[PDB]
Amino acid sequence: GKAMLNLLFSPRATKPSALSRAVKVFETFEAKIHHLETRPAQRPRAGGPHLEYFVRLEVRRGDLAALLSGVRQVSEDVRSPAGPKVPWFPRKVSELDKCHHLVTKFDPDLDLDHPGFSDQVYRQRRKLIAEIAFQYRHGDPIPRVEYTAEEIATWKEVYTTLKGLYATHACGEHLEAFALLERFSGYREDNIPQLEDVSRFLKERTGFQLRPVAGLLSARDFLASLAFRVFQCTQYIRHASSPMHSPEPDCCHELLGHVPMLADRTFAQFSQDIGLASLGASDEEIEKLSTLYWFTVEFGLCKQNGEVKAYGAGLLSSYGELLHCLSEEPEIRAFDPEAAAVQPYQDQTYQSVYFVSESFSDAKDKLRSYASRIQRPFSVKFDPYTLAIDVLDSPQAVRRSLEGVQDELDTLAHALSAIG
Amino acid sequence: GKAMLNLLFSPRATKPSALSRAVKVFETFEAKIHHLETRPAQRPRAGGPHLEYFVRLEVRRGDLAALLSGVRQVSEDVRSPAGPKVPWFPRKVSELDKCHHLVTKFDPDLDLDHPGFSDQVYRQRRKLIAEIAFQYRHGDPIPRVEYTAEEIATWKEVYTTLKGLYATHACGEHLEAFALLERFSGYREDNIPQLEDVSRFLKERTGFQLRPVAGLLSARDFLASLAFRVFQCTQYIRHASSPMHSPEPDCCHELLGHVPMLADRTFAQFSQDIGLASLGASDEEIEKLSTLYWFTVEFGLCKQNGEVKAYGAGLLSSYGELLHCLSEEPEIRAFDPEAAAVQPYQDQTYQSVYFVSESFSDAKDKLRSYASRIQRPFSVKFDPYTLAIDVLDSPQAVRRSLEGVQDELDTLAHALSAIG
Amino acid sequence: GKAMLNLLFSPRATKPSALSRAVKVFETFEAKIHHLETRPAQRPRAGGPHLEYFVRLEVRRGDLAALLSGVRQVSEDVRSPAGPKVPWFPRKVSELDKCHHLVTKFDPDLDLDHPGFSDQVYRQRRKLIAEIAFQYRHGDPIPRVEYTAEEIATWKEVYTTLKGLYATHACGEHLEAFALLERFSGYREDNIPQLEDVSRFLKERTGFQLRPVAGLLSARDFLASLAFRVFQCTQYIRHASSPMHSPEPDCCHELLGHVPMLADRTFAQFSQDIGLASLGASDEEIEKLSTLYWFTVEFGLCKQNGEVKAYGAGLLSSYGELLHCLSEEPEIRAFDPEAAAVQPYQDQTYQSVYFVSESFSDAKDKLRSYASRIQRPFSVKFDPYTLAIDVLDSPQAVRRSLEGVQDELDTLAHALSAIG
Amino acid sequence: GKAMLNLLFSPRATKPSALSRAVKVFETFEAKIHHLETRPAQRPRAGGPHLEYFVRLEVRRGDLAALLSGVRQVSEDVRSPAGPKVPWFPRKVSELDKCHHLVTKFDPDLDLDHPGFSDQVYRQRRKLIAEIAFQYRHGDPIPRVEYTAEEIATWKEVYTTLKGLYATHACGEHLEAFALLERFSGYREDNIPQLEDVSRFLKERTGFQLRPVAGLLSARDFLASLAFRVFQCTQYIRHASSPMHSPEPDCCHELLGHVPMLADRTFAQFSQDIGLASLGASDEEIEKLSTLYWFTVEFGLCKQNGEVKAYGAGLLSSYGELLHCLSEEPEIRAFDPEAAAVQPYQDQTYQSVYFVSESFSDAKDKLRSYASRIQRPFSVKFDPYTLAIDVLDSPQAVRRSLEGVQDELDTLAHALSAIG
Ligand SMILES: [Fe+3]
Ligand SMILES: [Fe+3]
Ligand SMILES: [Fe+3]
Ligand SMILES: [Fe+3]
C-alpha cells in the first residue's frame, strides 16, 4: 500500500538517541507505535557514538522523504530505502534457469578470454553450443551433441596421456571411479562420451546431474546451481592447439576432473554444502566462498594410502600442471576455510600454494564451521523429495523438517525390529 | 536501576492507536525509542476496539505513575505493573524444597478434613511424621519409620482383602508388578513396607522416587514434584476404623495403587510428562491438569486382552469403590484431555464416570497434544543426567539439547556397527 | 561351482533329529561343517513331531540327489531345491522397466474384460497407447498423447458432473488440490490435461510421478512400482457410452480420483509406504496388501470437520457410485489393517462396506504396524537421493543409513544455531 | 543340565577340515546337528593350515572328554572348555560393589608402596579410612571424615602454592571450575573441602560422584567404576614430608586434579566413554585403556588461546612435576589413541613424553574411534534414568533404546513448536 523503507540511519552527532524531536516528524506523517526499547547505553563498552535506531516509516514517498529531511535537520541522516537483504537466491530446481539465464545468457561471448582467436570454426561451434544451452529448459533432457574428428582426436590424445598418467599419483578413489566410468560411462580413447549418459549414470550414483552453459558468468549463481547438487558444464573444448594448457575450463577440464571425482556420496554431499552456503550470500561472502572452491575443488589435494595423491578437478584435468602440483616446488599447506578465506592466488601460471586435504569428512566439518560461522539472516536446507531448498527462518520450519526426520527414524526402527 | 512495568493497558475509547498524545508523556519521563511498527488495523477482522500498544516504561515510580496518569487523562487505562508471568516453578531436584515448602510446610494440619477425630494417637503420629517430613533436605535418605501393631494388623487385613480381588479385574501389568514387589519390595501381609527400600527399588526400576508429604497443599506444586519423576508420598495411614473407605489418600492408598503402577517405564515417563505440563502453569491451567490427573491416575481404567481392566491408583487402592468402578453402573468413557478438561466429578462417594484407557502410549500421545495446545510462554525438558529441568525458551536451548541427543545417537550408531 | 539347494525338508517319522544315519550320506558326498547345534527338544511345548534340520548340501546334482535318496530311505523327505523366497523385487528406478515390462507388457489385451466391444476405434486407441507405453524407457519423458473430440466431450461431461458434485461431500483437501490443478495443471472442461504436465506438477508437489500402463498385470508389481512413489497410469478412457460406470480404471478414473488426492505430502508418503510393505511380498501377502489397497485407496472415506467426507480415488472417479457410498445404505466400518486384511468385497456392484478414515496419519500408523507385523526375511528403505530402495538386511545397512540420518540432523542443528 | 564347552580347537595337521572321522565320535556321545557350511577353503588366501571348526559338545564330562580324546587321536587338539569371554563386568550402580570389593577390598595394604614408612599414625589413618570405605554400600551417603591439623596445614600450603601457580599455565576452564569450587564447594586454604559437598556439587554439575577407595587394585574395575560416571577416590593424604611429590594419588592429588576437571559436561561424558571401553575388556585391552588414561587424564595438556595450557589431573595435582611438564625439556606429542596405545612411560620421575590436546571434543572423537576399533563381542550403553549400563548384543536392544531416543526427539519437537 504505502512506501516502506529499510534501516540505514547513521547520523553524525550523538544526541539522536531518542532523537528528542524526530519521532514527532515520523508520526505526523503516519509513523507506527510498536514496543519501544532503546535508551542511552554503551556503559561497559564506552566511547559510544550515536545509536542505530530503526524508526520504520511506510507512507507515501513525499511524506517519508519530508520527515526524513526533518530528521536530518536535527539528526544527520535519512532512512535510505531499498535494503538489498542478501540480494536473492532461487528455491526450486526449475527456477535455477530464469534468474540465472537472465544473468548468464544472451551475452555474445567472444572467442576466447584472450582477445581474438583465429578459430572462426570454433566460433561457430561455441555459438551453436550456446544456442543449445541458452534455451535449455529444466527437466527436459539434453539434445545430443555431435563432435567433429578433431576434438575427437584430441579427446583421444588427452585420454591416452591422462590415462597414461592416471595411475600416477592420482586419487585412487578418483581412479576407480574413472574405471567404473570407462566401463559404464563410455570413456574411451577414440570416442568422447555425451553428457546425458554420464549424467544419468551419476544420478543413479549420486543424484547429481550436469547442466550445459557457455559462461560461468556468476560463480555466485554457479555455486547456487551446485547447491541443488547440479553441476554446470561447457560442452565445448579447448583449442586443439591448446591440448595440455587450458586457458579456460572445457570438457577436457570438466569431464575429466570434476565428474570422476563427483561420483562419491559424501564428497558430492560436501560439494553441495558449499553451494548451500552460497544462497543469497553477499558479494564479498560469495567471493570468499568461490575462493574456497578454488583451492578446494578445481585445485584439491588428497592423501591416499598415507602418502599424498591429487584429487583436484582442474588438477585432475591438467596434464603438465598436474605434474607441477605433484612436484615439491609448489607449496602445500593444509585445508582451512579461514586460511583459504583470503588465501591469494593467480589464474594462469602453474599455481604453487595448496591446501592439502586428508579426508572429505574433514572438509565437510570445516565447511560446517565456516558456513555456520558465515553470518546469515536465515538458514536453508535441501529437500531430496522435492529436490528443492528448504527455507529455514523460523522454529516452525525446523519443526516441519524434523517431523519427516523422525519419520525416517521410526522407519529405521521398524526396519531394525524386522531384521533378525 | 529504574522501575519497569508490564504490559497491561486496555483503554476504552478507540482513538489511542498511536496514543495520539501519550507517547509524549512516555518520553518526557525518559521513555525509549526502538523500531516502531504498529498502525491502525483490523481490516479483515473488522469491528475492532482500541489497539494494544506496548509502550514499555522503566523509570522511577513517580515518573511512570505520572505519565500513566497523563495517558489515562486522554486514554482510559494505565500500564498496570507486576506481570505474574506463569507464577513460578523450580528447576532442580533440591530446589523442590524451599519455594514449595514455604507454601506446603509449617502449616499445622488438623486431624482430618472432617472436623475432628478422637484419635489423639493419630494426632501424635501425624505430628511426628510431619516433623520428619518438615525438615527433610533433598538427597538425604529418609529416616526409618516405626509402625505400631494396629496399622500393622490393618495393613495385613487390606493386604488380604485386595490380594483375593487383586488378580481380579486389575491391570495385569500392575499385578505382576506387585508380584515383583512381594518378592522384592517386602510386600507382605504381616509386615508393612518401608518407603526408602521400595524407593531404591524404583530408582533401579525407573528412577522414580518417593518424597514424604503431609498436605497436598498445592496440586500445582504437587504435579511439579511429579514432573521431576518424584512422587510425594504419605507416611501415614487411614483410621483403623476406616479401613476400606479412606477419607484421604494414605500409605494404603499410594503403596497399593501408585507404586505398583509406577513400576512401568513408559507409564512412569507419561506420569512425568503430566508433571511437565505443570511448569509455572496458570492457576486454572493447573486446575485443568489436576483434573486430568484425577480421571487419569488415581481413577483410570485399562483394557487387558481387549476386556477392560482396572489401573487407576486410587481404584487400585480402594476396596469397595474398586468393586464399584469395575461394575457396570458407573459410566466409562475413554480418555481425552479436552473431554477431561472440564469433565465434572465429585470426591466422596463412588465416582461414576471414567475415561477408559486403551494403552499408556495413547495417554502419552494426547498428553503431548494438550501440553502443546496448552499455551505456554516457554517449554521445559528434563535432564536425566542432572535430574534437573531443561529450560526451553530459545532455539539455542533446543540446540544444546539436541547436541547431546545426536551424541547418544552416534553412540547407538557405533554400537550398531560394533554389534555383529 | 557345485549345485546348492534350499531348506525344504519335512520328514514323516520323528527319528531324523540327529538324522541318526544321514549326516554320513551328507558327508560322503561332500557335506560341510558349521557350528553343530540341534538335539531332541520340545520339552515345554510337548507333542512334537520330527525336527527341522537344515543340512545344506552343495555338490553335483547326482551326488546331492543320491544322498537325499539315502536320507529318504531312512527319513521320509528330500531337501527340495531352489527356494524362491519371495522370488523377486526391483531395487532402482531403472529396473522398474525390465522385470516390469517382462511381467506386464507384450501381452495382447482384448478390448475389455467383458469379451468383445464393437469399438474397433477403441481397439486402435488401446493398441497405439500400449505401443507407446510398451517401449517406455525410464527417465525419458512421455511423448504427447492426442485425444479425439469424443473423449474430449466426455471428459467435459464428467468434468461438469463431478465439479457439480465436488463441493458435495468430497475431501476438502483433495478439493483445494483440484483447485490448484485447475489453476496449474490444465484441468478444464474443454481440454483433457496431459500426464507429463500434471506429473511434473506432482514431482514439485510430492516427487511422485506417473508411468504409463495398459494392463495392471501384477497388482503385486503395481504396488511395487508405487513403492517407488511412481503411479502407473492408463492413458486411455472408458467407453463414451460408459461415462459414469467404469468397468475398468481409465484416465477418467485415475486422473480424477488418484492424483487430486495423491498431491498431499504425508498421504503420498503413506501411499508409498504401502508399496514399501509389498516389496517382494509373498503371493498371499501380496493379495492381502492389494486387498487393503482396495478398501483404502480407490475406496477411502475421509472425515472433514468431524463429519465424514469422501477421499477414495475410485470413489472420486465414480459419479453415481460416488453418490452411493456417501449415502447410508452402504456400510462404513473404520480403517483397520486386520479387519481389512481379509475383508471380503466384490468389484462390479456398488460396493457397500467401507473402512472410514479420520486421519491419514492414523492410516500411516496402522500400516507401520501391519507392515512390521508382516513377517519378512528382511526390511527395506527408500533413498530419496538416488530414488532407489535401500536394502535392510544387516546391522551394517542400518548403520550406513543412520549415518546420513545424523548428517541431516546436524544440518538441522547448525541451521537452528544459525537461526536467531 | 549337561556340560558345555567353548571353542578352543587348533589341531596341527591340515586334514581336520570336515574332521573326516570325528563327527562320529561327537555324535556317538550325543552331538547336535545344526545348519553346517564349511568345506576345504583358503583359495584366494592360499598357504593355509587346518580349518577352525566349531563342533560344540554339551554332554557329561565323561562323554565330552572321551570324544575329544578320540579327536586328538586323529586330529591334534581337544575342545578346551571354560571360555572366559571378556571375563566380567557389572551392569548396575549397586553391583559396582561386591564384584569389585571382593577383588579390590579387605586387603591389608602396607604403609606405602615404598616398603616401610615410620608413619604409624598414617597407618592408623589408612586403616580407619579403609574400614570406612571397605564396607561402604552403594547409594548410602558418606560418613564425615575428620582431619588433624597437619594434613590441614599442608593442604593449606599446597592450596596457596597451587592457587598461586594455578593462573600459571593451567586450563582456564579448569581454573574457573576451581573458582566455582572455592565459592561453592568449600575449597579454601585453611579448611579442606570434604567429599560429600563437592560430590553433591558434581551431581549438580554432571551427575558424576566420587567413591572412597584404598587400593586401585583393578584399574580394569577402576575404569569400570568410572564408566558409571563414578570416580573412586582415596580419602587419605600423602605424607606431610612428601607434600610436593606424592608417591601415590591422594586427596591432594584427586581433589586438586580430578574433581576440578570433571566439572565440564562433555569432558565428563568423555571420561565416562573411556570407562565404557573397559566393559569386560581383556587383560591386555585393559592395559591399553589404562595406558591411555595415563597419558590422557592424570597427565594431559590442553591448549588455551592457541598456546598450550595444562589440564592433566596429576599434573594439576603435582607442583614441581607441573612446572616440569609445561616446560620444554619434556616431550609433548599430540593425543593419538594408537600412538598412545603402546606409548611407553615410567611412573616415578618427571615424565617426559606428553600427548597434547586441542579440544576435549577431539579426545571424544579419538575415543569413539578406538573404542569402535576396539574389538568387543558386543556393545554397551549407559541409561541415565536407571544410572545403569545398557547391554547391546542384539538389534532389539538398539530398538528399545532408540525408541526413547525418538521420544526425547519429539519432546524437543513439541517444545520447538511451542516456543515462538
Ligand atoms: Fe571446473
Ligand atoms: Fe494417590
Ligand atoms: Fe485406481
Ligand atoms: Fe587420580
Residue numbers in the entry:
A (entry chain C), B (entry chain D), C (entry chain B), D (entry chain A): 78 to 497
The authors write:
The structure of human apo-TH (3.9 Å resolution) shows a planar, tetrameric core that comprises the CD and OD domains, and two smaller densities on opposite sides and 15 Å apart from the central structure. The final map, with an estimated resolution of 3.9 Å (FSC = 0.143), shows a central tetrameric structure formed by the CD and OD domains that is 110 Å long, 86 Å wide and 38 Å high. The two small masses of the RDs, separated 15 Å from the main body, have a dimeric structure and a parallelepiped-like shape of 40 × 40 × 22 Å. The two masses were placed on opposite sides of the central part of the TH structure, allowing full access to the active sites of the enzyme. In the 3D reconstruction, many structural features could be assigned to α-helices and loops in the central structure formed by CD and OD domains, in particular the α-helices involved in tetramerization. In the RD domains, four α-helices were clearly visible, two of them involved in dimer formation. However, there were areas of lower resolution, so we sought to determine the local resolution of each area of the map using MonoRes34, which showed a non-isotropic resolution distribution of the map, between 2 Å at the central part of the tetrameric structure and 10 Å at the RDs. An attempt to improve the local resolution of the latter by treating them as single particles did not result in a noticeable increase to resolution (7.1 Å), suggesting that this dimeric structure has intrinsic flexibility. The structural stabilization of the N-terminal residues 39–77 in the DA-bound state, both in full-length TH and THNΔ35, was necessary for their visualization, as they were not observed in the apo-TH state (whose structural model starts at the ACT domain) or in the THS40p conformation.
Tyrosine hydroxylase (TH) catalyzes the rate-limiting step in the biosynthesis of dopamine (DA) and other catecholamines, and its dysfunction leads to DA deficiency and parkinsonisms. Mammalian AAAHs mainly present as homotetramers with a three-domain subunit structure: an N-terminal regulatory domain (RD) that consists of a structured ACT (aspartate kinase-chorismate mutase-TyrA) domain preceded by a less structured N-terminal tail of varying length; a central catalytic domain (CD) that contains the active site iron and binding-sites for substrate and cofactor; and a C-terminal oligomerization domain (OD) responsible for dimerization and/or tetramerization. Inhibition by catecholamines and reactivation by S40 phosphorylation are key regulatory mechanisms of TH activity and conformational stability. We used Cryo-EM to determine the structures of full-length human TH without and with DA, and the structure of S40 phosphorylated TH, complemented with biophysical and biochemical characterizations and molecular dynamics simulations.
